[PDB]
A paper describes a structure:
The U2 snRNP has a bipartite organization, exhibiting a smaller U2 3′ module and a larger U2 5′ module.
To elucidate the impact of antitumor splicing modulators on the splicing pathway and reveal how the U2 snRNP accurately selects and binds the introns, we set out to obtain the cryo-EM structure of a prespliceosome arrested by SSA. We designed a model RNA substrate consisting of 54 intron nucleotides, the second MINX exon, the downstream 5′SS, and three MS2 aptamers for affinity purification. Single-particle cryo-EM analysis of A3′-SSA enabled the reconstruction of a ~12 Å density map that corresponds to the U2 snRNP module of the complex. Focused classification and refinement enabled us to resolve the U2 5′ module to a resolution of ~3.1 Å. In this map, we modeled the SF3B complex, the two matrin-type zinc-finger domains of SF3A2 and SF3A3, part of the intron substrate paired to the U2 snRNA, and the SSA ligand used to arrest the splicing reaction. Equally unexpected, U2 pairs with the intron, despite SSA having bound to the open state of SF3B. The structure of the A3′-SSA captures an E-to-A intermediate, indicating how the U2/intron duplex forms in at least two steps. The structure of A3′-SSA shows that SSA’s binding to the hinged pocket allows the initial U2-intron pairing in the form of the precursor duplex while preventing its further extension. The A3′-SSA structure reveals that FR901464 analogs, such as SSA or SD6, act at the latest stages of intron selection by the U2 snRNP by “locking” the SF3B1 subunit in an open state and preventing the formation of the extended U2/intron duplex.
Residue numbers in the entry:
A (entry chain A): 887 to 1067, 1074 to 1217
B (entry chain F): 160 to 180
C (entry chain A): 1 to 222
D (entry chain N): 387 to 483
E (entry chain D): 9 to 89
F (entry chain B): 16 to 82
G (entry chain M): 41 to 87
H (entry chain K): 12 to 45, 55 to 88
RNA sequence: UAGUAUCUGUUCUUAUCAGUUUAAUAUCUGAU
RNA sequence: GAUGAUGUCAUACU
């Protein structure tokens, strides 16, 4: 059963693109009892048009996350984070860390930092040094999140999803010493690393997100975080470029929470604060119901904003058109 | 005392409210 | 860092689907639940196509969906059981192309809880009464009638509760013009909770339960 | 009981009627539970752990027996050597294609 | 001290002494959601009476904004017995 | 106290986790996308998944312990 | 008084640092001074 | 001994002052003011280096006799 | 039926969090497993005390109240100054992580505490003037840090005379995504 | 016109009271130019007592009119009078004064009230500090969402009060924390409330009923504002603590969290491993596509 | 009015086990 | 460095 796939180059090998496929062997889901694991390697011959079976490296757990890393590859074998290098007949385990809590489901990489997603715990930051071959965990986040997938925004900020239908965005605080290095005397803050990652965004979509990407759908616009959901929906998250636009859309969302309640009687604020509270987002699914609301209610909402309902609709369309549609 | 400067404080508050608006 | 959420394409999977005269005309329409989005669709009898008349983001998990028609009426209302803890009766207005909250009865806390109802929903085929029900312990019956102005009146909820009981599926019974009867599949897990041998789980058989509701006597009898 | 005799309610309140024996401290007897948990970071238990070749971390608090202390040290050193990544990497142990 | 039965269609009321008060937390700040009470507490001679004292009701009883935020409006009939 | 799933100072591990598992199963059957996820993992219909979770509601953690 | 043990805290009461005690007024502190605790604490501080 | 006892330091020298004085040789994990003082560092070699370094530090005429 | 604390430390995989009383619970294995859960902040210590968690904080006098510096800069008649204090100089105070509770000696503990340079009052108490000199502004402990090499606990700090030049020692030694503007 | 209206405020009939208060309020709203500050202070002094009326219409009119006067005139003098009243009353109308301070904060800007209010807090008479704390509690409950820009500003005082020796301070500070957390719910103040949660939590073993009641109310407000996951994280160690008292307290808190947040806790329960007899792993949540 | 808090006073063999209970003491019940 | 428990005290706040 294939569960992970990646394409990468290597330092010991030339410009060949290697396809590494992680496969669980005879995995029974309920109850969980895996009989081992394999990582197939293919050389991707005939210019990206054919796979040739080169070798198959057996591993003990499910290699659930494969990611290229500085000319080598990172494989998450259960709770083990292994820096592998490509060998002749097998894959050579060059480094290993085993302070991951339960089970690795995703590995991200930007610069030297490696962001690892646990099946139940949050993102774990690993500082890898090319010297001494060490995977040093230096940060984590203090929430149990059943993370489906993750994404990278810059060197310090990581977005991610949940198995329950949430999207969180966490960020390392400034002036964290990334050059950390006995283990018996030294202890973390709470059963983890000595440094913790603060959450700067949390938002319940209501439908489980399995893919996030920081892209730009239309040319000439600006970058935005696109998510796709298991119920068939595609949404986006748009950063606010000014304080006044954020204040205006905050007031619009506050007015549409009260004067336009949701149809099922659910509180919109409590729906967006389902598992974790809403933070630093404005739900434009409710704000785009301003145009479908009654016109007397439209001017009744818009009179506190000191704007005409055409002007509110113009700002609502401008935040949708100045970013991706 | 404060009673002599009460009108000045009220005028300063009105000026601040005019400048804030 | 402050963000703004948008939906480029709404959810397209269908959890529940019911049919009826929601527009009040002779043609039949489909109400589908896309999870947190309720949609009204019109299957065209001539070209055979499907037109999505209305999409409304309800901002909550629609755990059940069933339509009922009153006796002699020509319009179908939508009974929505959600994670809000409230039972919501809606009517489609074709003039304004929106759903009007005809009734919103609050009975429990919000969320997909084990005993707050909303998961299971049943109607009487004559439209006299509906029964919302949870997985466990808790069934509520709302008797529905009309005033002289042809509106909808919902009664106070009649408790048909039974502790330590799992509900598999509830549905109404077409008894005719007699007392409205609701059919449940039930499991009695109390004997298997206190049996460490595990033999009780191997012998806990299901029960088909007929709850009769006497409208004049205004109570629910097993 | 320091200098003048302490009051008997002070004797019963501190717990000095209950005595705990530590084999690592040379079968030392400590009166009162608060002093008993106080001695584990003190110099006597540190020297007793030095005589046993045990670094006396917080894992060995509330440990009195010698055999229990060395069994805990063996298990802790085993799981610490397992958790630490010793340089046991493989570098082409099957030199063929 | 609370009835806590399953509320129905009956609307809770307040007397002239407690007009505007929240029946759960006693706060006078920001009423939010209309109070519903059980049918037994509104049956017969009890209709329209104050949900705190049982005296004559002159206004509709409300849960405060803080109580509805904490979903303290979903706990049952708040008539004090 | 009358709400099923709450506890007290004498709550046993078995009862607490049985409550957790039953709450979780009801939550899966409520949250459409959780059940969707579970129905994609195995190759079973949603109705079959609902049936399996309902059969698991009787004894989700197995028989209890003595004393 | 002029003793260093008597002080006025941040809470309006009076506190004796020698005995680690709180007193509502001056009379309670002077009754505490004649008590066994203050005499024994002064005898401990006498050495 | 990972904690070094510094004798010869009077009570006029503050515990944050002692922590800052021993902070240059290494990060003081813990401090205690008993007359004398105690400073526990992260590593024993760091404590030995601090004891060898600050022994000649006659702060206001008071040497910091730091011993393991 | 109850096993010893050493036996409980042997059976569980986390013997660090086992205390003396943890064997007396109804389920000790579940207790130590829940104490081994990651982000669970410790239970307050005064469950085992007998002094109601703050009745011992009596003799240590404290300042009555400290003010934040932006409000204190207003001299607390111009309300625009107060608007600037609450909206242009309102710095965030030093908060805490969720795993850091409070106890009796937390206020008087000074773990919050810059290697290679002591304070001005610390240098005055050490008989050292404050300045950019390399003859007296380094401490006398830095003389051994030149003679015996740099300390291993501060590898990024360059000692003057050992790892830093004498005239160069003036103190005796990615863009964010989604931000506004 | 207005000095003629001044003696009519002491009339006992509710209709005259309501109408005259509304008239004075509209005068203060759009025509306060032609009236000196001293007459408005006299009106405020007469108006303060009418905040505790039984009829909600007069209280609402009184709130509106006091707000209009506070908006019209400067904050400083009326605030000084109110703080003076706060210190010299120690009686039932102190809460009246408290309501008036909150009205000033909601109608005018709160940065005109918090500096002077907190500088008066440094006096060591204690009863004045309890008054400041009660004023802050009602102020935050009354202004609601507007308090989101003032959490940091009052965080040090709350740190001081939550660790003070006096237990009345702890109870009122917990009330401030509850009203704060419920007022800023969903506006990103999680870290400041987490910090204040670390000072609110150790008081869960307090025996006084009004205090442990205020602590549980603060915990419920914090469950709403920070989320049930953090509260559950604080809860899990003592749920099976050896001490029965600890188990009673922590199971009470768990019951409150569970009743308020039953469906959310599914995502927040810790991983409990299987044993030799029972299955405790929720395997479905361990599925990875 | 009757509730809480703070001072003063008292606070129970440096003689041994078992049982109830307690997180452990303490308390209570029997034997030496 | 471990200050608890009780009443005839006496003194303060609700
Ligand atoms: C049901 C009752 O409990 C019965 C009874 C006899 O109880 C003793 O009387 C209660 C009434 C109590 C009243 C009216 C107390 C007066 C209070 O005054 C303080 C100052 C508070 N005032 C406000 O909060 C005022 C205005 C607020 C901001 O705005 C509005 C619109 O309310 C609270 C009390 C009113 C009765 O409840
Ligand atoms: Zn010992
Ligand atoms: Zn009732
Ligand atoms: Zn009443
Ligand atoms: Zn309320
Ligand atoms: Zn004294």
């Amino acid at each position: 059963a294939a569960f992970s796939v990646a394409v990468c180059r290597f330092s010991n090998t030339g410009e060949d693109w290697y396809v590494l496929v992680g496969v669980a062997k005879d995995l029974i889901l309920n109850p969980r009892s895996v009989a081992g694991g394999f990582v197939y390697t293919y050389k991707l011959v005939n210019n990206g048009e054919k796979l040739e079976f080169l070798h198959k490296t057996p591993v003990e757990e499910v290699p659930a996350a494969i990611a290229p890393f500085q000319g080598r590859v990172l494989i998450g074998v259960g709770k083990l984070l292994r820096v592998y290098d490509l060998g002749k007949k097998k894959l050579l385990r060059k480094c290993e860390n085993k302070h991951i809590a339960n089970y690795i489901s995703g590995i991200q990489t930007i610069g030297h930092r490696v962001i690892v997603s646990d099946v139940q715990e949050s993102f774990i930051w690993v500082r890898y040094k090319r010297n001494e071959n060490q995977l040093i965990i230096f940060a984590d986040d203090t929430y149990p999140r059943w993370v489906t997938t993750a994404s990278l925004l810059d060197y310090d900020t990581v977005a991610g999803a949940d198995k329950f239908g949430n999207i969180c965005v966490v960020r390392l605080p400034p002036n964290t010493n990334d050059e950390v290095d006995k283990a018996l005397w030294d202890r973390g803050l709470l059963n983890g690393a000595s440094q913790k990652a603060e959450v700067i965004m949390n938002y319940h979509v209501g439908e489980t997100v399995l893919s996030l990407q920081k892209t730009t759908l239309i040319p000439g616009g600006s970058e935005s975080l696109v998510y796709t959901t298991l119920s068939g929906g595609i949404g986006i998250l748009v950063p606010f470029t000014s304080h006044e636009d954020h204040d205006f859309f905050q007031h619009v969302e506050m007015h549409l929470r009260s004067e336009h309640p949701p149809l099922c009687g659910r509180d919109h604020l409590s729906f967006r604060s389902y598992y974790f509270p809403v933070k630093n987002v404005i739900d434009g699914d409710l704000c785009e119901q301003f145009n479908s609301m009654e016109p007397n209610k439209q001017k009744n909402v818009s009179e506190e904003l000191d704007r005409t309902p055409p002007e509110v609709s113009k700002k609502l369309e401008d935040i949708r058109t100045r970013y991706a549609f | 005392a404060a009673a002599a400067a009460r009108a000045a404080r009220a005028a300063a508050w009105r000026a601040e409210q005019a400048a804030a608006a | 860092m402050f963000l703004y959420n948008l939906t480029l394409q709404r959810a397209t999977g269908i959890s529940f689907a019911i049919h009826g005269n929601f527009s009040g005309t002779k043609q039949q329409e489909i109400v589908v639940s896309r999870g947190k989005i309720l949609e009204l669709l019109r299957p065209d009898p001539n070209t055979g196509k499907v037109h999505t008349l209305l999409t409304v983001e309800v901002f909550g998990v629609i755990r059940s969906l069933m339509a009922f028609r009153l006796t002699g009426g020509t319009k179908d209302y939508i009974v929505v059981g959600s994670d809000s803890g409230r039972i919501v009766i809606l009517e489609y207005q074709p003039s304004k192309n929106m759903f009007e909250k005809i009734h919103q009865e609050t009975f429990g806390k919000s969320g997909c809880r084990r005993i707050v109802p909303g998961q299971f929903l049943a109607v009487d085929p004559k439209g006299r009464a509906v029964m919302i029900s949870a997985i466990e312990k808790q069934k509520l019956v709302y008797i529905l009638n009309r005033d002289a102005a042809a509106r909808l009146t919902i009664s106070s909820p009649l408790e048909a509760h039974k502790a330590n009981t799992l509900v598999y599926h509830v549905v109404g019974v077409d008894v005719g013009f007699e007392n409205p009867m609701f059919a449940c599949l039930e499991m009695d897990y109390e004997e298997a909770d206190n049996d460490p041998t595990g033999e009780a789980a191997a012998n806990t058989q299901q029960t088909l339960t007929f709850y009769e509701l006497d409208l004049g006597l205004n109570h629910v009898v097993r | 009981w320091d200098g003048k005799p302490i009051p008997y309610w002070l004797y019963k309140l501190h717990g000095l009627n209950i005595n705990y024996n530590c084999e690592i401290c040379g079968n030392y007897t400590y009166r009162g539970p608060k002093a008993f948990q106080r001695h584990f970071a003190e110099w006597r238990h540190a020297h007793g752990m030095r005589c046993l070749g045990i670094p006396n971390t917080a894992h060995f608090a509330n440990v009195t027996q010698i055999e229990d202390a060395v069994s805990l040290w063996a298990k802790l050193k085993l799981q610490k050597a397992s958790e630490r990544w010793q340089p046991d990497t493989e570098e082409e142990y099957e030199d063929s294609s | 001290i609370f009835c806590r039965k399953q509320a129905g269609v009956a609307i809770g009321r307040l007397c002239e002494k407690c007009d505007g008060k929240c029946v759960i937390c006693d706060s006078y700040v920001r009423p939010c959601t209309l109070v519903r009470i059980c049918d037994e507490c509104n049956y017969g001679s009890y209709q329209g009476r104050c949900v705190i004292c049982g005296g004559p009701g002159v206004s509709d009883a409300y849960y405060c904004k803080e109580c509805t935020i904490q979903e303290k409006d979903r706990d049952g009939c708040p008539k004090i017995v | 106290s009358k709400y099923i799933g709450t506890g007290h100072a004498d709550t046993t591990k078995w009862e607490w986790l049985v409550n957790q598992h039953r709450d979780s199963y009801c939550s899966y059957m409520g949250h459409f996308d959780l059940l969707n996820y579970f129905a994609i993992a195995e190759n079973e219909s949603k109705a079959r998944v609902r049936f399996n979770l309902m059969e698991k509601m009787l004894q989700p953690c197995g028989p209890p312990a003595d004393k | 008084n002029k003793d260093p043990y008597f002080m006025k805290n941040h809470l309006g009461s009076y506190e004796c640092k020698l005995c680690l005690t709180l007193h509502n007024n001056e009379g309670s502190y002077l009754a505490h001074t004649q008590g066994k605790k203050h005499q024994t604490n002064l005898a401990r501080r006498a050495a | 001994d990972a904690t070094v006892y510094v004798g010869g330091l009077d009570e006029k020298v503050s515990e944050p002052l002692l922590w800052e004085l021993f902070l240059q040789a290494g990060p003081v994990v813990n401090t205690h003011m008993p007359g004398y003082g105690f400073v526990e560092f992260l590593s024993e070699e760091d404590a030995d280096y601090a004891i060898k370094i600050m022994n000649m530090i006659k702060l206001y005429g008071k040497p910091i006799r730091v011993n393991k | 039926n109850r096993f010893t604390v050493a036996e409980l430390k042997q059976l569980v995989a986390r013997p660090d969090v086992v205390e003396m009383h943890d064997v007396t619970a109804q389920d000790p294995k579940l207790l130590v497993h829940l104490k081994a859960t990651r982000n669970s902040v410790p239970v307050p210590r005064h469950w085992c005390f007998k002094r109601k968690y703050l009745q011992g904080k009596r003799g240590i006098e404290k300042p009555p109240f400290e003010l934040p510096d932006f409000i204190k800069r207003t001299g607390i008649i111009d309300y625009q100054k107060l608007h600037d204090a609450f909206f242009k100089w309102q710095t965030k105070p030093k908060l805490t992580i969720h795993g850091d509770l409070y106890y009796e000696g937390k206020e008087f503990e000074t773990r919050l505490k810059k290697p290679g340079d002591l304070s001005d009052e610390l240098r005055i108490s050490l008989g050292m003037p404050v300045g950019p000199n390399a003859h007296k502004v380094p401490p006398p402990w830095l003389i051994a840090m030149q003679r015996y090499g740099p300390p291993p606990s501060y590898p990024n700090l360059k000692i003057p005379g050992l790892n830093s030049p004498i005239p160069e020692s003036c103190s005796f030694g990615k863009p964010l995504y989604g931000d506004v503007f | 016109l207005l000095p003629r209206l001044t003696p009519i405020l002491k009339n006992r009939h509710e209709k005259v009271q309501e109408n005259c208060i509304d008239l004075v309020g509209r005068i203060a709203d759009r025509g306060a130019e032609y009236v000196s500050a001293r007459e408005w202070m006299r009106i405020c002094f007469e108006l303060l007592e009418l905040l505790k009326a039984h009829k909600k219409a007069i209280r609402r009119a009184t709130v509106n009119t006091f707000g209009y006067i506070a908006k019209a005139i400067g904050p400083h003098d009326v605030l000084a009078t109110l703080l003076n009243n706060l210190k010299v009353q120690e009686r039932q109308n102190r809460v009246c004064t408290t309501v008036a301070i909150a009205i000033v904060a909601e109608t005018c800007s709160p940065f005109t009230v918090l500096p002077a209010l907190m500088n008066e807090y440094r006096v060591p008479e204690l009863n004045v500090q309890n008054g400041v704390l009660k004023s802050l509690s009602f102020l935050f409950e009354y202004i609601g969402e507007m308090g989101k820009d003032y959490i940091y500003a009052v965080t040090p005082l709350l740190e001081d009060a939550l660790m003070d020796r006096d237990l009345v301070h702890r109870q009122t500070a917990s009330a401030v924390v509850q009203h704060m957390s419920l007022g800023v719910y969903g506006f990103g103040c999680e870290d400041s409330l987490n910090h204040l949660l670390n000072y609110v939590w150790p008081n869960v073993f307090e025996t006084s009923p009004h205090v442990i009641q205020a602590v549980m109310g603060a915990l419920e407000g914090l469950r709403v504002a920070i989320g049930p996951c953090r509260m559950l994280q604080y809860c899990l160690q003592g749920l099976f603590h050896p001490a029965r008292k600890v188990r009673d307290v922590y199971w009470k808190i768990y019951n409150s969290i569970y009743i308020g947040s039953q469906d959310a806790l599914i995502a927040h329960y810790p991983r409990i491993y299987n044993d030799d007899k029972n299955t405790y792993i929720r395997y479905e949540l361990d599925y990875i596509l």
